[PDB]
Amino acid sequence: SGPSCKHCKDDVNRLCRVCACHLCGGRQDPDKQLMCDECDMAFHIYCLDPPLSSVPSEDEWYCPECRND
Ligand SMILES: [Zn+2]
Ligand SMILES: [Zn+2]
Ligand SMILES: [Zn+2]
């Protein structure tokens, strides 16, 4: 059940827009990021200039982009 790369392995650039936050497209620490099971994307809670600091750690939740659905 280890993490897998979707558009990174196929893309020579090896960007992790999916596994990593699309804003950074990789070059980040997915351990401090939360993944959305519905969108399977990372949130910037810690990438914004100011860090959210709460870091739920649960990593199991939905991002506000799809929660409004
Ligand atoms: Zn990836
Ligand atoms: Zn980022
Ligand atoms: Zn989502």
Give me ligand 3 centre to Cα 61, in Å: 8
Distance CA 48, CA 9 (A): 26
Distance CA 17, CA 6 (A): 9
Domain boundaries, the chain: 1-69
Give me ligand 1 centre to Cα 64, in Å: 22
For this PDB entry, the determination method is NMR
Protein residues within 5 Å, CB atom, of ion ligand 3: 36, 38-39, 62-63, 66
CATH of domain 1-69: 3.30.40.10
Closest ligand by atom to 23 CA:
2
CB 35 within 8 A of CB 45: no
Distance CA 15, CA 64 (A): 23
The alpha carbon of residue 19 and the mean position of all alpha carbons in its chain are separated, in whole angstroms, by: 5
| Residue among 55, 62, 57, 58 nearest 40 (CA) | 62
